[PDB]
């Protein structure tokens, strides 16, 4: 199989559904983590290491920041190589 089509194709699908299908659902479940509350309430260096010091703002209308791009892109790459690797096993000698 052509790696460029399969890997890019799978990544596009996983980015497309993530942006257009599961974005609303994913955000709602992320608020279920708000009900519990913040991890720590302190002002020491080690307490600062547990806070969202940097907020990744995005200009995308739906709020599809880079962290979401990395998450959904990784799944597409993972699925893409699974498809390629399995298809490679066809026509393998002594393997």
């Amino acid at each position: 199989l052509d790696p460029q089509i399969v890997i890019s194709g799978s990544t596009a699908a996983f980015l497309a559904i993530g942006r257009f299908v599961f974005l609303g659902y994913q955000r709602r479940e992320a608020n279920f983590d708000s009900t519990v509350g913040p991890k720590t309430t302190g002002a020491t260096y080690f307490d600062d290491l547990q806070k969202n010091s940097t907020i990744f703002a995005t200009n995308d209308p739906a709020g599809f920041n880079i962290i979401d791009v990395a998450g959904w892109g990784a799944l597409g790459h993972a699925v893409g190589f699974a498809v390629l690797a399995i298809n490679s096993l066809q026509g393998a000698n002594l393997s």
Binding site: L1, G9, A13, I17, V21, F22, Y25, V83, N87
Partner: protein, 194 residues
């Protein structure tokens, strides 16, 4: 109440009377919690609707002479090409999974966000059969009764094939040939001591 599953019994309290297809059948009291029953009510309809499509599809394939429901995906294994009504299809297995996963995710994801809708209507009822909303009681009862019947039938397809290995239509023909000598009591599988 659509009937009584066990004549002379008392209907469970937690099963509302107007619920379509309510025969009072809940031996294990799985629907006792109102929140759980609400989910079960939706799942039964969705399971039945898929079963109705599946049983109709499984019978249709063999009636028209295109094989049985079990052999349909063998082309993707042996190396042949897909066929629909005898018309060759240009896709392969890995391609098919792509369209289905994306297509079904969009539809099911859209349905999921509706928060438990089971009778949408509107664009899903173009002919307006249930637009009345008052006479829909019978149609909802007819849908669930055919849905439950289809779910039982499909389990028969899977169970029967695992025992005899023949298709649903072939099995029916074999029963009619020798009703007393060809049935579940003659598999050699269903009843070990027969």
């Amino acid at each position: 109440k659509a009937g009584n599953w066990l004549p002379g019994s008392d209907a469970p309290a937690w099963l509302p009377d107007d619920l379509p297809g309510n025969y009072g059948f809940d031996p294990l009291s799985l629907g006792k919690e109102p929140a759980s029953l609400k989910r079960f009510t939706e799942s039964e309809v969705i399971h039945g609707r898929w079963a109705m499509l599946g049983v109709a599809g499984s019978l249709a394939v063999e009636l028209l002479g295109y094989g049985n429901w079990y052999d349909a995906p063998l082309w993707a294994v042996n190396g042949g090409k897909a066929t629909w009504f005898g018309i060759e299809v240009p896709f392969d297995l890995n391609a098919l999974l792509a369209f289905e996963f994306v297509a079904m995710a969009a539809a099911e994801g859209q349905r999921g966000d509706a928060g438990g809708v089971v009778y949408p209507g509107g664009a899903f009822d173009p002919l307006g059969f249930a637009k009345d909303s008052s006479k829909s009681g019978e149609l909802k009862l007819k849908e669930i009764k055919n849905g439950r019947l289809a779910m039982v039938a499909f389990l028969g397809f899977v169970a029967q094939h695992a025992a005899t290995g023949k298709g649903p239509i072939a099995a029916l023909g074999e029963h009619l040939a020798n009703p007393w000598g060809a049935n579940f009591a003659t598999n050699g599988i269903s009843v070990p001591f027969f």
